[PDB]
Amino acid sequence: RTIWNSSIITQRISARGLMNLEDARPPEAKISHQSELDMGKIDETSGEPIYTSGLQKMQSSKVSMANVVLSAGSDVIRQAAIKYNVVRTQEIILFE
Amino acid sequence: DYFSLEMTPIIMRPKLYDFDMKRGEPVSLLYILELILFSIMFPNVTQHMLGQIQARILYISMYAFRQEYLKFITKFGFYYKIVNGRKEYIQVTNQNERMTENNDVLTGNLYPSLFTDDPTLSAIAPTLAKIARLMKPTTSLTPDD
Amino acid sequence: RESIKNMLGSGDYNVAPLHFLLHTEHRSTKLSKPLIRRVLDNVVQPYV
Amino acid sequence: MQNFIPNTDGQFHSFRACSYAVKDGGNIYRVVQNGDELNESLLIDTAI
Amino acid sequence: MTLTYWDKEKRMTLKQMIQQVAINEQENELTHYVFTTPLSMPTFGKPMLGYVPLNEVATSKFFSNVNDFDRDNQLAMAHFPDTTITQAYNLTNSIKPGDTSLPDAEVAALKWFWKFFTSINLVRQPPMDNVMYWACQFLSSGTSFLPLERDVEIVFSGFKGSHICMFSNLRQMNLSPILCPYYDLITNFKTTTEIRAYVDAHEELKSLLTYLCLCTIVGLCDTFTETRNMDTGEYVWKVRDVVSRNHTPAQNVEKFCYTIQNAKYMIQLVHVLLFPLTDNK
Amino acid sequence: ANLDPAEFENTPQLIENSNMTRLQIALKMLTGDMDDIVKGLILHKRAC
Amino acid sequence: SAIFELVNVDLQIYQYGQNIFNNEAEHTILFLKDNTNYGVIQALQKHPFSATHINWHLHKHIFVFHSREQLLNKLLSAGLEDSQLYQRQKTYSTKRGDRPTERMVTYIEDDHIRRIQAVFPLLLDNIFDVKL
Amino acid sequence: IDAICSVEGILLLILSRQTTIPGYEDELNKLRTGISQPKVTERQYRRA
Amino acid sequence: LDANAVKRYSVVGYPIDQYRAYLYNHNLLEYLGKKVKREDIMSLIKALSYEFDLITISDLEYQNIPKWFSDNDLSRFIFSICMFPDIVRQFHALNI
């Protein structure tokens, strides 16, 4: 081989190898980082899932597929319809 | 249907449908008389519409009585609150929105003005004591053994 | 409740929705240990 | 037999319409249902 | 224990309070203002019942410039002295699952405070130059409350600069079971002397409200600049001549694009939490 | 001041504050780890 | 009081100067809906040309001008008048009236008008042969 | 009119190096590293 | 929930990228919550009509009315009209 990466090119490798070469852990297999499996509460005001430690899942610059989502159910297209009642007070022309 | 609506247990506070009134001319007094009759004929349903009737009659008075109106506001502004047996009056010191009708006026410690005597009400703004005294039912109270 | 109600008698009934001028909404119905109490100044009093 | 909630004591002084209500573990259902709520079956006219 | 001030790196709010510098300048503004009873102006006959939270989503919704969804009377369940509070600091009128309420004094204090916060755009709050004056007064002279006699500039150095994240880890910060005993002291009629002794002693809330007044002034000023020392990840940002060149909220959308009614919220805040330090009515 | 009404002292807010959040989200996402471009490398022959 | 409680709008009226055969309103005074001070500051914030005395009548009236440089001359005239008043006050020869001072306040952050109004209260000694 | 204003704003974001947003300021120096100011002019602006 | 006990939404954990989840929570929490007063709608429909009128509105609950305010309104206007004068043509057309 001739080429060689000079820096790190593995940020998108969640897991490498599900084998068992000796019926145990392969001595160089990689399970995911605990950072990407965090499910923390969300501030109930603006979503923004946060890690369980308190750090927000928006600043670490590390993807993670373990967050939470909202769901409405049965009323999202309840459309804005109101009714109004008008009443005049002064006619345009009197004596008429 | 209106007549039967007299007795069945009311469960949702009712609001009046139509309201016509000329701003300056003295004809609106007809509308005042209309609701006076509607009160003297079904004293029950009025017991709830009291909230709306407050603001409506007060508006109409304001355009047809001025001394009485603003003097009355000054003293007996808008709401009873029974503190401990006494009755403190809270006002609305702003013509921001006086003609509102949605202030849960019949449940909670918040009573409408115009109605409970405080005999000083009369001899302060006549025609308003005269209105109020005309509407209270004063028929009876019967048991139903 | 629907499966049972179709096994005691006949007909239909609702679960206390709340109306408005145009739309209705179907409030939740759980009813664990119902109690009747009087509510002075929109604050449930204890029994007396 | 239908009518059992009286609608007035007469005097338009402190009436304080009935206030029993069923509490059901946090949630509370009222009998008279204060707040902005009605249905055209109950919006009444005066010209009648 | 108050909150680990986050930056991608933890903190304790104490490093982050000794991190700054408050250095004075010329042009003595011999303009000693006066305090004022903080105009509670509470009223409306349409509340929101149920379980209203009172700690974290509370403080965030109110002071993190999050959605300006009219943020109205929902706190009106601070009148009606018979409501209750559940230890998670949920204000309610019906404790459902046999959950317990707090003792009295706590309830009195907490209701007092939020009651002061109820209905802003009917409150008649004082112009903001004066509240800037009081804020810098406090954080400069200390709890002694001597007039300024000078003018002051604030400067921060070394943060992986994220003043937005300052406002954020504010958004994630609880305060009620921190400032409860303080307003409790103000409820049962103690006096300026002993409560100053108190605030000097406990010092957990001292750091807090130092940070809080600081954040409100940096969010409502407009003589603000920032810079990144481009050799490391370290921002130095300064706000210059805080009290003389500021008379209205800000709109420069480069620092913290701040809306209006939440700004009057914030000034009500600093007003009503510096109130009990000072002298008579 | 006080002639220019209040908000002409600077660049005007163009994008709405709500949409700004959606902007920030996409930015932080597409510039995070999901990036691909990488700099530099080294040629060398080895039989490893 | 009765009027304001009955209408709830700010009330604006003009002043058409001397020499009757003129009708252009050289300026306009304006009465406030809430005689307290907070309302005075409030209404003064808007209305991009404004001024008010220190006399108690402050609580009931604010001024509104037409231009940028129509302020200057009114401020200078009021300043000359305040000079005369300070003088006649020095010897306790105050006429049958009030209004301790004549100078004005404003919120125009104009370098020139602020320079004038700042340097003024340090020259309240001399007499300036007003209009004679 | 809000739509046209937002269009103009978002387009103003990826050009005109002399403007940032209150925060990141760096992934912008990741994004706009493709335009190569100042080779950009009208013909290009209108196409954008 | 809320008073009157009407189910609004339900929170639920799930495997999904952080950004999409942030967005789903955000636009939902936007669709909830009173975005405009009542007297405000009153004022609008008053301004767009005859000058001697009384107006009454009803049931501004559970209905989502998109806001047409901004502290910047004047700024965005003066910016638009300045570099795109053709807009005044359709202005005039609306008026006619």
The DSSP code sequence of chain B is -TTGGGTSPP-S---B------SSSTTTHHHHHHHHHHHHH-HHHHHHHHHHHHHHHHHHHHTT-SHHHHHHHHHS-SEEEESSSSEEEE---SSSS-----S-TTSSS-EESSSS-TTTSTTTSTTHHHHHHHHS--S------
Residue E253 · residue F13 · CB < 8 Å: yes
Q: Which residue of D has its CA nearest to B18?
A: D45
Do you find a cis peptide bond into H38, omega within 30 degrees of 0? yes
DSSP chain E: ------SSS---SSTTTTTEEEEEESS-----------------S----S-EE-SHHHHHHHHS----S---GGGGTTSSTT-EEETTTEEES---SSPPBP-HHHHHHHHHHHHHHS-GGGS-PPPHHHHHHHHHHHHHH-TT----SSEEEEEEE-SSS-HHHHHHHHHT---HHHHHHHHHHHHTT--HHHHHHHHHHH-HHHHHHHHHHHHHHHHH-SSEEEEE-BTBS-EEEEE-STTTS--S----TTT----SHHHHHHHHHHHHHHGGGS---
Report the distance separating Cα E89 and Cα A79, nearest Å: 35
- The token pair that represents G44 in the structure block: 């003064």
Asked if A12 is an interface residue toward chain F (Cβ–Cβ < 8 A), one would say: yes
Residues 6+ apart with CB under 8 A from I96: none
The CA distance from B89 to B75, in Å, is: 8
Cα first-last separation, chain H: 19
Structural domain span for residue E149? 1-281
Q: Resolution of the experimental model in angstroms, please?
A: 3.9
Locate tokens 């420069």: which residue? Answer: E252
- How many other C-beta atoms are found inside a 10 Å radius of the C-beta of residue E65? 19
> What are A43's strand-pairing partners?
A47
Q: Let me know: does G39 contact G8? Beta carbons within 8 Å.
A: no
Phi, psi of B28 (to 5 degrees): -55, -30
Check CB contact under 8 Å for E256 and H20: no
Render I23-79 in DSSP notation, one character per residue: HHHHHHHHHSS--S-HHHHHHHHHHTS-SSEEEEE---SS--------TTHHHHHHH
Identify which of B137, B111, B144 has the alpha carbon closest to the alpha carbon of residue B46: B137
Query: What are the φ and ψ backbone dihedral angles of B49, each rounded to 5 degrees?
Result: -65, -5
Q: Identify residue D5 by its one-letter amino acid code.
A: I
CA E70/CA E46 separation, integer angstroms: 14
Nearest to G65 by CA among G78, G81, G83: G78
The amino acid at residue E195 is I
What is the Cβ-side half-sphere exposure of residue A28, based on CA atoms within 13 angstroms?
0
Taking each helix axis from N to C end, the angle separating I18-31 and F17-30, rounded to the nearest 10 degrees, works out to: 170
Picking from G77, G72, H7, the residue whose alpha carbon sits closest to that of residue F14 is H7
Partners of B88 in the β-ladder: B81
Asked whether the beta carbons of E209 and E183 are under 8 A apart, the reply is no
Query: Are F11 and E253 a contacting pair at CB < 8 A?
Result: yes
**The tokens of D31 are what?**
């009998």
What is the edge-to-edge ordering of all strands in the sheet holding B87-90?
B87-90, B79-82, B111-112
State both tokens at A46: 């603006």
Long-range contacts of G9-12 (CB under 8 A, 24+ apart): G9/G33, G10/G43, G12/G64
G8: Cβ–Cβ under 8 A, 6 or more apart, which residues?
B94, B95, B96, G33
Distance from CA of H23 to the nearest CA of F (A): 10
In angstroms and rounded to an integer, the radius of gyration of the C-alpha atoms of chain H is 12
- Cα–Cα dist E160/E11, whole Å: 13
CA separation for the pair E254, H25 (Å, rounded): 10
Q: Report d(CA D28, CA C18) in Å as an integer.
A: 13
**Chains C and A touch, contact meaning at least 3 pairs of CB atoms under 8 angstroms apart:** yes
Element (H or E) spanning F14, and its range? none
Tokens of E81: 């002295």
Q: If you compute the radius of gyration of chain C from its CA atoms, what whole number of angstroms results?
A: 16
Query: Rounded to an integer, what distance in angstroms lies between the CA atom of residue E268 and that of residue E277?
Result: 16
| E111: Cβ contacts below 8 Å, ≥ 6 apart | E78, E81, E83
Bridge partners (DSSP) of residue I56 are A85
Q: What is the Cα E107 distance to its own chain's centre?
A: 20
I40-48 contacts, C-beta under 8 A, 24 or more apart: I41/A82, I41/I65, I45/A84
Question: Per the structure block, which two tokens stand in for E213?
Answer: 């007044």
CB–CB contact B70 G8 (8 Å)? no
- Category of E83 on φ-ψ map: left (φ > 0), alpha (ψ -120 to 50) or beta: beta
* Residue A62 touches chain F, beta carbons under 8 Å: yes
Nearest to E246 by CA among E227, E261, E267, E265: E267
**B3 vs B11, B34, C41, D44, D46, CA distance in Å?**
17, 17, 32, 12, 13
Q: Which residues pair with C36 in a beta bridge?
A: D22
Query: Quick count: other Cβ atoms within 10 Å of Cβ C25?
Result: 16
H17: helix, coil or strand? coil
Residue partners of A61: CB distance under 8 A and separation at least 6:
F28, F32, F33
Cβ neighbours of E124 in G, within 8 Å: 38
Q: Is I12 on the interface with B (CB under 8 A)?
A: no
CB–CB contact A87 B24 (8 Å): no
Using the Cβ of H34 and the Cβ atoms of chain F, whether some distance falls under 8 Å is answered with: no
Mutate which: C15, C19, C20, C42, vs I, most I CBs within 10 A: C20
Q: Are E12 and E109 spatial neighbours (Cβ–Cβ below 8 Å)?
A: no
**Closest by CA position to H9, among listed E117, E191, I42, F13:** F13
Residue A54: which of G33, E13, E24 has the closest Cα?
E13
Determine the Cα–Cα distance for residues E167 and E219; give it in Å rounded to an integer. 9
User: First vs last Cα of chain D: how many Å apart?
Assistant: 28
Q: Which DSSP symbol is given to G60?
A: G
Alpha helices in G27-69 (DSSP H): 37-45
| Measured distance CA(E25)–CA(E153) in Å, rounded | 7
Establish whether chain G is in contact with chain D, requiring a minimum of 3 CB pairs below 8 angstroms. no
Based on its alpha-carbon atoms, the radius of gyration of chain B, rounded to whole angstroms, reads 16
Measured CA to CA, the distance from residue I62 to residue A74 in angstroms comes to: 13
Task: List Cβ neighbours of E81 (8 Å cut-off, separation of 6 or more).
Answer: E111
Q: Which two tokens stand for residue E261?
A: 């009614």
Chains that touch I (3 or more CB pairs under 8 A): A, B, C, D, E, F, H
Integer angstrom CA distances of residue D43 from B14, B107, C21, E259: 6, 20, 9, 41
CA nearest neighbour of E43 among B134, I12, B110: B110
Count of CB pairs separated by less than 8 Å, F with I: 30
Q: Which of I17, I19, I79 faces F12 most closely, judged by CB atoms?
A: I79
Total structural domains in chain E? 1
Query: Of E65, E26, E15, E22, nearest to E239 (Cα)?
Result: E22
- Inter-chain CB proximity G5 and B66 less than 8 Å: no
Residue I14 DSSP SS3: coil
Chain D (1-48) residues lying within 8 Å, Cβ to Cβ, of chain C:
19-25, 27-30, 33-34, 37-40, 43
I20 three-class SS = helix
Tokens for B75, please give them: 């003293």
Q: In H, which residues are within 8 Å of I88 by CB distance?
A: none
Tell me how the structure was determined. Answer: cryo-EM
**Cα dihedral E43, E46, E51, E57 in deg (nearest 10):** -60
A73's enclosing H/E stretch is none
**Is the Cβ of I34 closer than 8 Å to some Cβ of chain E?**
yes
Chain D residues closer than 8 Å to B135 by CB: 12
Dmax over Cα atoms in chain F, in whole Å?
78
Count of CB atoms situated within 10 Å of the CB of B3: 9
Contact I54, I43 (CB under 8 A): no
Closest CA of chain F from I52, distance in Å: 31
Six token digits for residue A65: 């597929």
- State how far the Cα of E180 lies from the Cα of E110, in Å rounded to an integer: 7
Distance CA B51, CA B101 (A): 6
Contact E83, E91 (CB under 8 A): yes
Give the torsion sign (CA, A13, A15, A18, A20): positive
